[PDB]
Amino acid sequence: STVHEILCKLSLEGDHSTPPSAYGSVKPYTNFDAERDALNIETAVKTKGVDEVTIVNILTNRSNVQRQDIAFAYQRRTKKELPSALKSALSGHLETVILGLLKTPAQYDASELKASMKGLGTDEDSLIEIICSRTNQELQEINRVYKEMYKTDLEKDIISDTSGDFRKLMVALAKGRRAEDGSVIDYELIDQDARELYDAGVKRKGTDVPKWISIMTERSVCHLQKVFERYKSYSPYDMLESIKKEVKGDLENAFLNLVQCIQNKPLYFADRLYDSMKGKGTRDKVLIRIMVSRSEVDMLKIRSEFKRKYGKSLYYYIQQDTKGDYQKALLYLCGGDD
Template identity: 40%
Template sequence: MLFKSSINQFVSFRMTSPYATIVDNKEFNAPIFAEKIDRALRAGDKDAVVQVLTSISNAQRQLLREPYKLKYGKDIIAAFDKKFSGDLEKTIFALMETPLDYDVKQLKAAMKGLGTDEAVLIEILCSRTVDQLRAIRVTYEKEFGKALEADIAGDTSGEFRDLLVSLVTGSKDGSHDTNDALAKDDAVRLFADGKAKLAKKDGTHFLHILATQNQYQLRKVFAYFQELSGGTIEKSIEKEFSGDLQKSYLTIVRAASDKQKFFAQQLHGSMKGLGTRDNDLIRVLVTRSEVDLELIKTEFAELYSKSLADMVKGDTSGAYRDALLAIINGNHAIAH
């Protein structure tokens, strides 16, 4: 009992991002909230389930599992599985996974069966921090009994494969250190790659630099590159590369330069045109909801002259739409 109360205390007072839409709910009580979930499930009230789950943080959602199992004799995820389906079920499952487990399962699903969802691999592996990538690698092998880099190598090829494997195996600098002289040298190397039309057989300087330098150093490299070439690093990548490799390098550049702008673009891309890439939409909203979704919302409105909530309203419907809007609007009004 003492152990459980200490966990609840930890959840109540842990550090939360000032830019999160979902934060810890100070009124949270695991057994009471588990009972609310069961009551809503028995009544078939999907909206009520969504309201409960989006009114609490991810850490608090994890604390629902044990009291739910003890009182009702079944796993809460299995209970959700019986009542939900489609994109709403994906959203509920995403909310109930820890961020780490969710990333790991997304990566596995992206490489499962025929065909590979390269967009998922690119977004996760090219935008996560060094510590996050390290944890993903360890958890993936523990969960699936095979190294993540081995699965990636079996599903991809060429410099694209080499880049992703390099990121996963921990070659990226995790510090905040910068070095002006090295940044200038690296900018020259990148410029030379473009001038030589990337004829290297052993991978380009782009691979080595973008896969190893920390985001602060990369920003200096990009600035010097623009001074040297008269154009942005993004323009150079768009000109010299194609396909998944181009998308990967652009993701690293954009995530290093302005992560919130990058995710705003990801969200817009998931909804523009015919059809919605719902898995991508759900993933970004859920994974950023306790990190920087407030900033992403601001960036989205500036980029597209339309609020993220309005675009989601126009692209989704029903309880699924309401769940996404609850994540976007957040729980600040009821959590304090």
């Protein structure tokens, strides 16, 4: 029946389920009550002036699945979308954060991608980030959600907003077909691949790009880590440096990003986070995106790397470059200092 069709889509939680990810700084609330949270939130938004402190305190303190529970209980009581309430109730950088926290990981990345590709000049960095960083599983969920929301393939949007070997590189990566190379180590292949990167690379006048795309999209991370090392027995420059000498533009931007993620991903974000705060003022768009998307994945390692390299903790840097509940939100998302 159509009672079975609705019956197919549901379940409940409270021990559920098992996405721990110790590398996340955001853990589900212990004693969680979705209804009582939706309640207080509704109470907080109706307060003249908008008690923010409550809303921020609750949402940055609940896990993503929890937020999803909270948001549904809210539409149940109020007959209105929580996402729409907060977009009205909040403003500035704090709104951008809470609204990003209110999305599923896939939905967030999907919406971020769409935002970048709107227009002639894309917002280029953000596209590259997600793409280069996301795993095969993360990426295919982005492909699902992106279709559901925008009634189009993500591939086609990339094709419209990109040209040349850039488009080539982005379409290939976004396919999320990379290998896993779990146990057996392929030494000739490692060596073969190193030689190819060199042969299409520094060795040759100009560059043979698709050759680089194939290896760096297809091969597994581990295999590439080892490839990038063996690479050095061929070229005077390491992989990162060769890219700078071989190519330029957004192609260069992309390959550089992709290589770091493969080599060390948490360090990659650590660096991007440092870069977002280092000058006069800050780049908030990048700072928020990372803090929202890595909060449940690698944040603990990003922290480790961030301190090892820069000497001071991510927490310290957030305090210093952000003030207000916006800051407190980032800090909750960060989880503590090192």
